[PDB]
From a paper:
The two membrane glycoproteins on the surface of [name], [name] (HA), which functions as the receptor binding and membrane fusion glycoprotein in cell entry, and neuraminidase (NA), which functions as the receptor destroying enzyme in virus release, form the basis for defining subtypes. [name] binds to sialic acid (SA) glycans present on host cell surfaces.
The final model contained Sia-1, NAG-2, Gal-3, and Gal-5 in the RBS. Although glycan microarray data indicated NY107 to have a specific affinity for [name], few interactions were apparent from the crystal structure. The branched Gal-5 interacts with Ser137, to help stabilize the [name] binding. In the structure, Gal-5 also interacts with a crystal packing symmetry mate and thus the flexibility of whole [name] may be restricted.
Residue numbers in the entry:
A (entry chain A), B (entry chain C), C (entry chain E): 10 to 142, 144 to 158, 158A, 158B, 159 to 220, 229 to 261, 263 to 276, 276A, ...
D (entry chain D): 1 to 172
E (entry chain B): 1 to 176
F (entry chain F): 1 to 171
Write the structure that this text describes.
Amino acid sequence: GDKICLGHHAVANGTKVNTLTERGIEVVNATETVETTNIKKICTQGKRPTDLGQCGLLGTLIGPPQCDQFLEFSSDLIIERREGTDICYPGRFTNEESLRQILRRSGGIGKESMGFTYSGIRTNGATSACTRSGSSFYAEMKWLLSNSDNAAFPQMTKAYRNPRNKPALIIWGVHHSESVSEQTKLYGSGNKLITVRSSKYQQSFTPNPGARRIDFHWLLLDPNDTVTFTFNGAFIAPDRTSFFRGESLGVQSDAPLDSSCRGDCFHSGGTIVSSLPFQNINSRTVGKCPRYVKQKSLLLATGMRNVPEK
Amino acid sequence: GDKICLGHHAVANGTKVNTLTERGIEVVNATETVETTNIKKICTQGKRPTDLGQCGLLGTLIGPPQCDQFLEFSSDLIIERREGTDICYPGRFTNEESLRQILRRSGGIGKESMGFTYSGIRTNGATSACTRSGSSFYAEMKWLLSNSDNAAFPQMTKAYRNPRNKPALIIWGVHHSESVSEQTKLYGSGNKLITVRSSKYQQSFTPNPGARRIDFHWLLLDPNDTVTFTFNGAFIAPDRTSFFRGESLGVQSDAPLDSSCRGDCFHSGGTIVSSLPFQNINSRTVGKCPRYVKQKSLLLATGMRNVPE
Amino acid sequence: GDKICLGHHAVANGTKVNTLTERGIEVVNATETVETTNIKKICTQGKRPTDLGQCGLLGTLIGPPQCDQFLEFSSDLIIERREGTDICYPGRFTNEESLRQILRRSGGIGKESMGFTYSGIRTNGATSACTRSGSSFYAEMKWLLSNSDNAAFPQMTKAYRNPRNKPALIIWGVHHSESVSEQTKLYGSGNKLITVRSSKYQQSFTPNPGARRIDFHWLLLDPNDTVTFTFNGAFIAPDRTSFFRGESLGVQSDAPLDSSCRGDCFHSGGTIVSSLPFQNINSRTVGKCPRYVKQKSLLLATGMRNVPE
Amino acid sequence: GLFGAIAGFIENGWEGLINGWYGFRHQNAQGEGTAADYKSTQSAIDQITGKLNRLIGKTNQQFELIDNEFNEIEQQIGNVINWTRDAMTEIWSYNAELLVAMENQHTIDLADSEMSKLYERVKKQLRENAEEDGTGCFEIFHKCDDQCMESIRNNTYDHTQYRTESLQNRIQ
Amino acid sequence: GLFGAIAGFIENGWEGLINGWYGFRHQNAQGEGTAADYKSTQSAIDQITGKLNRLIGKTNQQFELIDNEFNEIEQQIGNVINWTRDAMTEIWSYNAELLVAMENQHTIDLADSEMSKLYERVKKQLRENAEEDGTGCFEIFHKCDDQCMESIRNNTYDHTQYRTESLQNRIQIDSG
Amino acid sequence: GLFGAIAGFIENGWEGLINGWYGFRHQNAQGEGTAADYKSTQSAIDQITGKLNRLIGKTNQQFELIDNEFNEIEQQIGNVINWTRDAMTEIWSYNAELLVAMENQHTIDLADSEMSKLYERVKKQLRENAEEDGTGCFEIFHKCDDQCMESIRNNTYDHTQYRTESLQNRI
Ligand SMILES: CC(=O)N[C@H]1[C@H](O[C@@H]2[C@@H](O)[C@H](O)O[C@H](CO)[C@@H]2O)O[C@H](CO[C@]2(C(=O)O)C[C@H](O)[C@@H](NC(C)=O)[C@H]([C@H](O)[C@H](O)CO)O2)[C@@H](O)[C@H]1O[C@@H]1O[C@H](CO)[C@H](O)[C@H](O)[C@H]1O
Ligand SMILES: *[C@@H]1O[C@H](CO)[C@@H](O)[C@H](O)[C@H]1NC(C)=O
Ligand SMILES: *[C@@H]1O[C@H](CO)[C@@H](O)[C@H](O)[C@H]1NC(C)=O
Ligand SMILES: *[C@@H]1O[C@H](CO)[C@@H](O)[C@H](O)[C@H]1NC(C)=O
Ligand SMILES: *[C@@H]1O[C@H](CO)[C@@H](O)[C@H](O)[C@H]1NC(C)=O
Ligand SMILES: *[C@@H]1O[C@H](CO)[C@@H](O)[C@H](O)[C@H]1NC(C)=O
Ligand SMILES: *[C@@H]1O[C@H](CO)[C@@H](O)[C@H](O)[C@H]1NC(C)=O
């Protein structure tokens, strides 16, 4: 007689997914949840990028010849390159990595004079390591030494009050001479000490002669607080200080910039553009990113169990 | 004809919740899982609290004037305050936060005399920076000088063995003079050196004159082990050592103490009292706390789907 | 009347488990997911183990008597023991833990001569603190001093370029004398200065008389790069440098080795051998381990609800 | 729900059922009446109570201070702590939202289940004496007074007593 | 599936059904016809879309670099960072694996449930006019033409209209 | 159980059923007989085995020593390590408890589902030849011998053969 039958759809070949009780069960339709497609470029559309190139991120503060174009910059996406260098004269920043992390999210920097004027000493200390218009020095810094060879450097005090609405990034250097004789030539004989003090900071520095270097040190000065420098030689003085602009991201990559694609997740290999919750491209990312997973593929079922016709 | 119908209950106004397949589905009843009610006090009922006030935690070991009332405290809940300072004379502790963390869970400290006696030198070193009744010094520390101006400080050795069943906290200080001629005035002439030695610690110190300061260094001495001090000047000697009492929890807060409420979860803004599994009050907590989540509310359904008439 | 009844199986004595809805519900069968059975041994089957024993891991680089048999070794599993020490003469390594962590995964070390030769000085400097058959010194190092008491040590430069495919671990020491007069006796009077320089490393060292210690310092030298030593005394020179073999796992334990059991998860009290997803043995493990949980037991139902007759 | 009773073939709930979660509404010559079923209601409440016993009143583990509000710790350690704590926040936020969503999905299906169980109990209880109309009601093909309606709710209904009468009515 | 319809008592799916997820296949004196059911199809699609709305296109969490890929940081803190990241990787990989497996289980059962619901709905419509054959079909015991088949699909079938014919075909004995 | 068969309308399980997980028990003129069903039993066992394949024999990631048991490291760093480790313990203890509880909930409902599917299978098989007892039994309204009981078990029972006899018994 007459009859009515109830049923459901199917396809010839569905997609295999995993469940709590079964591996490789076939469903009508599925979708990927793990992103594996990478864009081998830095996507900078709708952003204000800064490609540092030759210049080191920490170099923007002290100003070696390679960072002349970045002494003041405004950015929301800072790109660091492998060839970047912070220094010209031998030496290093103490707490360098934590300072890089602050500068990466700063939004860029603005410079302001600290207003130090000097008397009875020389200010024009230069080096052929930092060559800018023939034998110069760090652009934001001043190399202080005696008026003539072997003369005694006077016990000096310089104070700076932060007049602004935000924290000031204060930078200073300690010069470690090639020898005891050279330290004597530049600053006069005897032991040297550099003391830096604020309401939250307190440190003393002694030069260690033997191999030519300038080591840089830093602090963040609160609004209306005063930083005090006491020194009798081997002191690299700040001429300017830095103030942060707003908000940014910092990326370490050798990938070319592209102004034709929009991205919010960045890594060394380029840009991840996805609406998916997970990614398998890179464990080290910056920005708004899917969580890193070790799996290549995790298919989510978007349909019923596939049961093809016999 | 006659009939019997089966059905369920409903309310006029249900509660919206979220599921795996739906957002804002209406149910009969729901219960909140995220704690949002904060108590703006440190709930100290049942506890033995210590409000450190003007005294800094590390100051309790050396004894500047601000900490004279905390040389031997006993608590299970240590509260640090914003206005607390560890020192009077300029200087600092090496590994200061490591020492703070050890002290916060110490249960408080008991002090014990190390028993050092001296001859041929002064022991009465005092400074105007630490006024107690005129010029004085750290309560648990001795400032050692030469007998007179520019006199030679003799090479000295002092030893202390730990007679207790628990580790002893040893503190000592290195005095850095204002100038080179200052160092020669208080102590002898020439290079000064301080060596501190135990069975698993050895370190030498040299003072760097030019800026007036005293820096403090420390070690933990095991039972039946000995600390040896060898020095010839610029040395701030310990008079008493510290032994820990038991267990405690350390809190940093601006909230007032209240002995009328009980709590075990603390933060800068007070106490979280809750049986709920999550909280949105503060991501930085101490003690036994519900886990912090970003969400303001997460309603758990405690009823069927609400289908009104 | 004829009838056919449908039903399921059951046992008289079932196993109680937990669900989202109920605590202690009885099911037919269940299996444990949390490992609690520990093996009080370090399982070394299928591996190449090195039990350092009395030798401290850092000692393998400089060579005190305790580490003579481990100057060169090859391993995929390095076991540190409580009784291990790095030095014979008093002194320490700079950034010691960082160096330990690099050596734990090194796969062992191979040694190579740096080809330093000397003239106008003595190279046979020794101490009773390091005995082998009488007074000896660090096997990989050379204690350089003047030809006779109070003689002038000549200003020397010694350079070495890494000729290998992988980085070289360069070690050197600074000798701090017991007194100024001892420093004069061994090296001659005057300021002593040691500088160490590669393309990525630059540091100068001055001795600090009064201590009696040899402090060791280190750097990683890239392929085809050169390290330069400039010194005029108080310098403990390397004779050999190290190169890493491959991959290994570092373990800290007091448990004896066992070549008859196999495992990949190690801890202080032995080896966890399991296929289960969780373990309640030790929160501090190394290698490939089940994840640590604080529950002693979590039973997974492998059968239906049990309803006995 | 997965069982298609609550918000399914049963149109809507009853706002006048305050004595329980599930119940019976009868219609005969004596007028209508409503009564709650204890067994199905209690089974549902116990299961929700079980979820609450799991989530509420947990014993949490102790954590201590690792940074400092008054005196800032070294910058590199501080950045590692902040990176860790915020990553912990994201995991727990994820876990909490998933747990609630998952439990809510189960709770709704759970209550829908108990309604279906009760409906099926009555179906097997009435045998050949009743037909289901499709809305959740059973059409009784015999005279069933208040005491007879009682016997269905009480689970003491004897289908043999009314079988002949109801089979006569179902056929013609 | 938990409900025993899809991959259960219903042999297989229909590949010819392209206009929906669930459908009817009738057979009468006029021939065979196939039609999709809207209510059951959309109810399944909406619940799947609900899952997609929870997982796809959501506000990702914020990330910053604590490492240095150009010049290596200190070993001790670097090993702590690496240890912590790998621990997060293990947690998130577990979360991802479990989430998908749990959702896939619920999805399959969800679809199976809707097939069961539609089956039971038709069963109640037909009352005493039809019997289940055990394969997902209903043997109708009265002449049901194309209009009658349509009234079952759009829920306007009145069982009273055909009851007398049906009971005469179902009960093929003498009643005394 | 969500499906209401096991610990539901079926009073209790059978301890004598060692043959399988689900089975049939019949009463007729020749006595009682119990036999297990292969299809349902295998379906339930296969799914529980599936859960075990997910949890047991996993490959885990390698973790190195970041601490020092013999030479105590800087307490500031050590306390961060101890904080992180204790936080990982908290997360995994949560995950483990939830995973097992969720799986146990699903296992019990899964097994209950299989009982129901078998019950429904037999119902549609018997057509108008039997009536439901309410306890998990079917009252057969025709004389059904051991051969007839076997035909129901292995799905070869023809209801048309017994329909006439059954209907007049039901009136
Ligand atoms: C052979 C020669 O002329 N050497 C001079 C050297 O030049 C270096 C090059 O050989 C090398 O290839 O590149 C490096 C760059 O890293 C040098 O350019 O430079 C010596 C140092 O110098 C200055 C400098 O840094 O450029 C000159 C500068 O005015 C001065 N600034 C001051 C004083 O504010 C600095 C400063 O004194 C030091 O940097 C402080 O540490 O130095 C230069 O001295 C060269 O000289 C040789 O020096 C030795 C003594 O060591 C003898 O005096 C030789 O007679 C002299 O040739
Ligand atoms: C199936 O899912 C895919 C994504 O995986 C999507 O592109 C498509 O719209 C879906 N539907 C069909 C009928 O393929
Ligand atoms: C609904 O739940 C709340 C808890 O949020 C409780 O206070 C209240 O008693 C409950 N109401 C009913 C009617 O069960
Ligand atoms: C059930 O599981 C237990 C424990 O895992 C095992 O020993 C046993 O072989 C299994 N089967 C039975 C019938 O107990
Ligand atoms: C980490 O976060 C805390 C609280 O938001 C903040 O006070 C501190 O400045 C942060 N630390 C660093 C190193 O940026
Ligand atoms: C951490 O791991 C990365 C690779 O993911 C490696 O490049 C780096 O050397 C590791 N860091 C340390 C300090 O071992
Ligand atoms: C961390 O915990 C271990 C025990 O698990 C303990 O021995 C160690 O002292 C702790 N570290 C610190 C810095 O307190």
